[PDB]
């Protein structure tokens, strides 16, 4: 019964290879979304600035990298801050959430909705234009 067991030991290895392939495909697609959202943001701001003939005021703009804490408008926040600004302490009387900049970018639509399998024709046009030619297959796939 040699042959039978060696068939098992190759289906084991194959299953192991297959799921490591699934993980790296997901990780790769996440990297591709980050590339699209970032280049998309840099271009939108580039054209915006070369229309206003000027870069936005120092405020009114949040530069990457950042994270966002959001809470209801009626939440009471109080804060302590150290002098050097190396330590902050915030109290909230209601729940909050925290989001990384990349997921804010996805919510803005900068990943062209690919993060949701939903993509316009004018969205996959630009999404595919923002990646190297060889990874356009992935982008078309993530738009179902």
């Amino acid at each position: 019964g040699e042959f039978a067991q060696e068939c098992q030991n190759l289906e084991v290895e194959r299953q192991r290879r297959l799921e490591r392939i699934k993980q790296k495909q997901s990780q790769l697609q996440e990297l591709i979304l980050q590339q699209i959202a970032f280049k998309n943001l840099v271009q939108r701001n580039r054209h915006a600035e070369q229309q206003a003939s000027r870069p936005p005021p120092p405020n009114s703009v949040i530069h990457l990298p950042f994270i966002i804490v959001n809470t209801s408008k009626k939440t009471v926040i109080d804060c302590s801050i150290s002098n050097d600004k190396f330590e902050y302490l915030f109290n909230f009387d209601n729940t909050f959430e925290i989001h990384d900049d990349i997921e804010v970018l996805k919510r803005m639509g900068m990943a062209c909705g690919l993060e949701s399998g939903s993509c316009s024709a004018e969205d996959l046009k630009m999404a595919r234009s923002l990646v190297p030619k060889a990874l356009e297959p992935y982008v078309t796939e993530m738009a179902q």
Partner: peptide, 25 residues
């Protein structure tokens, strides 16, 4: 792309409409 990696006040406010928002850097 030094100074082009940013979101505006409007961008952030619209992702979380009606939320108080802190941006931590």
């Amino acid at each position: 792309n030094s100074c082009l990696a940013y979101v505006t006040h409007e961008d952030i406010c619209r992702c979380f409409a009606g939320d108080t928002l802190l941006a931590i850097r």
